[PDB]
């Protein structure tokens, strides 16, 4: 359970995300399909894109990274109560997209590093820990689904 401290520093630096949820979103997804490129693989709409210009210039990419981060900001804002908003996520993750936990782990990562690099300002050490806490709630709880769901994720 992460306490209201660490909630506002995840907020704080979601704050800043929002000035720009797209260009966040690119670079993101970006990441982790540079970092680990099986997670691409996942993306039947995105798998024949071969190199970052390409990702960058893919509208459709910077859509769905709009679409993934609005819902990571509407789970975060949630402060931990976001039965609701994992539901449907989690059941399409499990189900219709198949994506294990290792997948959730390594965008964890991406999101971090992102965050890193444009926000030192808002996230320095003690910063990164709440979103880490934050993160791996998430990723605890989607793992309970994945479970109640039938996947082993
Ligand atoms: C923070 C973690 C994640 C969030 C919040 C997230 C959010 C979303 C949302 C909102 C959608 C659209 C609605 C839906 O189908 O549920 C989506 C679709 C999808 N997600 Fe994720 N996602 C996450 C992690 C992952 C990861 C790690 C993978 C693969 C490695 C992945 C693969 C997909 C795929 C393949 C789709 C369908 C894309 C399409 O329209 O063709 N997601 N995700
Ligand atoms: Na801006």
Known sequence: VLSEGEWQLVLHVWAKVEADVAGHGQDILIRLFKSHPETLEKFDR????????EMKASEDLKKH???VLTALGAILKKKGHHEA???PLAQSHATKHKIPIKYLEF????II???????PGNFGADAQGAMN??????????????????YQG
């Open 46 to 53: 995105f798998k024949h894109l071969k190199t970052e210009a």
């Open 65 to 67: 990274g709009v679409t």
């Open 85 to 87: 908003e994992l539901k």
């Open 107 to 110: 965008i964890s990562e991406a």
């Open 113 to 119: 590093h992102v965050l890193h690099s444009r926000h």
């Open 133 to 150: 806490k934050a993160l791996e709630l998430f990723r605890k709880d989607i793992a309970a689904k994945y479970k109640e769901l039938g």
